[PDB]
């Protein structure tokens, strides 16, 4: 905001993807697809966490047979989340053999590096595109440098070698990835697949490379782009790498749906990737999913236990109130609340939030000004400052986000 | 890498900051500075975690008296980490009254919005600059939009109003922040402070604004820049916002030292901010601090418990081996290890790492190829695949990062 790269709109089920539409969050299950109970449950969990589209692997016949049942069960729950089928090597076979699965999916993902080789590859690709066209389904053509077509790389390495100034092998691999996606995009369009039925991706695992790749894809094609840093890994590394890779592109207006490719720790839920995706988009002002807290790090000017506990309590309370607030108070997802440690940046940061509190740091009288809408609202003192503040936030929301219209 | 914005070199103690030098990680204590034992311990903890420079608040007389003792104790431990003193409102008084503190610090931080007002402000600023010059200390002039000089904003709001096409109030606040830093920079230089003694910052709490601000600062000044998203907040939000704000600038070559402004949860250590800072710089290929793991998210094609546990074990083992490895094997900090869930992207991603393993996913024979230096090394099978792989990684490191020269 802004400006978005303009693109045609591609509907993935009821969710529109493209330049005129909010950037969508999506995620992918990790249960065996043949396990209908486990996969249905996880799709629900991911959707409830904020995944607007959910992808599942459709890797073998047993998975393919399961898809119509999963979709049936989701619909029985009144949940219309679009499902993307992830196909590799035998997608043409499964789509051919299981038309009920083909119809149940809301989008097909093809990888131009896992279609086979030679004219087998061309025919496999054409069959899947033909099936999509016949059913009116959209397709993501998704290249990944982990599965890059070796024949194409060879072609480009030779082209490069003849150049007056040849590029490194690494630059050529990135070129080939882009070329793999662009050639398949152009082929699909030439076969009759609509511009309203084509999404592209070309993922790599390092941020700097990803920025290069998606700038090229954005320039060379008109399609909405599925953006993600592939194989981002574990823990803080996976979170940081993902945000670092996506933000430069998103700030330039590139990307129409995102997925965060975290490796879960055994103890953490699959939904973490959805939480990260939401935070990336909200950090950049591109979506508003829920209220957020701006808080200083705290330093020697404030008492650490009190301040850290206050900031945590405020974050926890906003999370708890949200289901009620969403129902009563349109627009509350945009709420910004500040919790600040001392007079140095307290009042100023608080006056930039919708409502904020500045605690007394060292050398200050034990009172805590509260600011709302850019000016002083009141001053709190004594015990229970946390609870008094949260009541003020509650009152603030009731008034600022009152419905009607 | 690249290209860095060129800047003169500013030494903060023994650490050089500037375009010719690696981007430094720093952090700030949150213990009361007057508490010598607590603050000395935390500086050590932050330095041991990777903080190359450490800042502490010097907020009152009791803090000021403590600084020489903290520095003495650090030196007794053989630890030469540079200390930055953070001054607000009374910095001129503390530096005047406690020359031993002024000498003990390796850098002074001034905030042009916490100097006072009117010609008092000018004189306070001049006194601190004069003290730095006399002691040969460098200075960070650090503006923060949480403490923006109201007189300057008023000046610019009037300038804006007279324009043919006035900007929003928000754009003007950002303009004023930049102007506050630039005017103080130019004043300091005019007083005789060397270009080798001046670092600048101008922090705001939203990523998109920060990118704007630092692009302006980079254009209008020649100083090395201390880059950070101020008041980033808690949890995943704080991590993501910080990475999203910094990466666009770092990829453009802007920024010579960084600090990540996380609010700690009560149960998490202050060192988390250092871990995040390291991951941002390493994600962008600007520093190498330690080996890292590239791993897929896992999906229905692989068994989740086995794969997630393997990837975790590998990450844990690299962390455990690092102290030994650093001593024996120069350059090992650059090691990239892949752990992949199935044949779709396993081999290709693994061939982009120094060494990687591709597990058997569904429909594959129960064996696991290992790749090193871009080609197949061997194939593992049976129980104990994790341990066999880690021995191969150990052997790989011994050979690829052998010393000598
Ligand atoms: C499932 C895979 C298969 O190509 O999907 P992509 O969209 O290429 O990338 P990502 O979302 O990182 O998931 C892992 C990949 O293996
Ligand atoms: C300590 C403060 C004081 O201005 O320092 P800055 O460098 O402005 O910003 P940050 O590093 O986010 O720390 C919090 C600020 O209050
Ligand atoms: S606002 Fe005050 S307490 Fe918070 S980090 Fe800044 S100086 Fe320290
Ligand atoms: S590499 Fe295989 S197991 Fe890992 S996410 Fe990709 S398809 Fe799934
Ligand atoms: Cl997805
Ligand atoms: Cl999981
Ligand atoms: Cl710092
Ligand atoms: Cl802490
Ligand atoms: K898990
Ligand atoms: K803590």
Curated annotation (Swiss-Prot), chains A, B:
This is 4-hydroxy-3-methylbut-2-en-1-yl diphosphate synthase (flavodoxin). Converts 2C-methyl-D-erythritol 2,4-cyclodiphosphate (ME-2,4cPP) into 1-hydroxy-2-methyl-2-(E)-butenyl 4-diphosphate. GO terms for molecular function: 4 iron, 4 sulfur cluster binding; 4-hydroxy-3-methylbut-2-en-1-yl diphosphate synthase activity (ferredoxin); 4-hydroxy-3-methylbut-2-enyl-diphosphate synthase activity (flavodoxin); iron ion binding. It catalyses: (2E)-4-hydroxy-3-methylbut-2-enyl diphosphate + oxidized [flavodoxin] + H2O + 2 H(+) = 2-C-methyl-D-erythritol 2,4-cyclic diphosphate + reduced [flavodoxin]. The keyword Metal-binding applies. Pathway: Isoprenoid biosynthesis; isopentenyl diphosphate biosynthesis via DXP pathway; isopentenyl diphosphate from 1-deoxy-D-xylulose 5-phosphate: step 5/6. The lineage of its organism: Bacteria, Thermotogati, Deinococcota, Deinococci, Thermales. One of its GO terms (biological process) is isopentenyl diphosphate biosynthetic process, methylerythritol 4-phosphate pathway. [4Fe-4S] cluster binds at residues 296, 299, 342, 349.
């Amino acid at each position: 905001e802004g400006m978005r790269r303009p693109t045609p709109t591609v509907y993935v089920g009821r969710v529109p993807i493209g330049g005129a539409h909010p950037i969508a969050v999506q995620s992918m299950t990790n249960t065996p697809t043949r396990d209908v109970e486990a996969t249905t449950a996880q799709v629900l969990e991911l959707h409830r966490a904020g995944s607007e589209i959910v992808r599942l692997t459709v890797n073998d016949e047993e998975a393919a047979k399961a898809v119509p049942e999963i979709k049936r069960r989701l619909l029985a729950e009144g949940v219309e989340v679009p499902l993307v089928g992830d196909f590799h090597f035998n997608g043409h076979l499964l789509l051919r053999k299981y038309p009920k699965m083909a119809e149940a999916l809301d989008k097909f993902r093809i990888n131009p590096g896992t279609l086979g080789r030679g004219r087998h590859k061309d025919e496999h690709f054409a069959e899947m595109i033909r099936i999509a066209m016949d059913l009116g389904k959209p397709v993501r053509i998704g290249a990944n440098w982990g599965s890059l077509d070796p024949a194409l790389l060879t072609e480009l390495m030779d082209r490069n070698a003849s150049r007056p100034e040849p590029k490194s092998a690494h630059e050529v691999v990135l070129e080939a990835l882009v070329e793999s996606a662009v050639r398949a995009y152009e082929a699909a369009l030439e076969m009759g697949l609509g511009e309203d039925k084509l999404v592209l991706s070309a993922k790599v695992s390092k941020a700097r490379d990803l920025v290069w790749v998606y700038r090229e894809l954005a320039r060379r094609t008109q399609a909405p782009l599925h953006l993600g840093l592939t194989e981002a890994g574990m823990g803080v590394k996976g979170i940081v790498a993902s945000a670092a890779a996506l933000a430069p592109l998103l700030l330039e207006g590139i990307g129409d749906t995102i997925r965060v490719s975290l490796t879960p720790s055994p103890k953490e839920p699959r939904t973490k990737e959805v939480e990260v995706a939401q935070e990336i988009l909200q950090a950049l002002g591109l979506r508003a999913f829920a209220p957020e807290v701006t808080s200083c790090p705290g330093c020697g000017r404030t008492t650490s236990t009190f301040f850290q506990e206050l900031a945590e309590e405020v974050s926890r309370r906003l999370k708890e109130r949200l289901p009620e607030w969403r129902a009563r108070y349109p627009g509350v997802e945009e709420l910004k609340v500040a919790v600040m440690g001392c007079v140095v940046n307290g009042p100023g940061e608080s006056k930039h939030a919708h409502i904020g509190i500045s605690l007394p740091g060292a050398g200050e009288e034990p009172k805590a000004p509260v600011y709302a809408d850019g000016k002083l609202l009141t001053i709190l003192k004594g015990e229970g400052i946390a609870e008094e503040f949260l009541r003020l936030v509650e009152d603030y929301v009731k008034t600022r986000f009152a419905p009607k219209a």
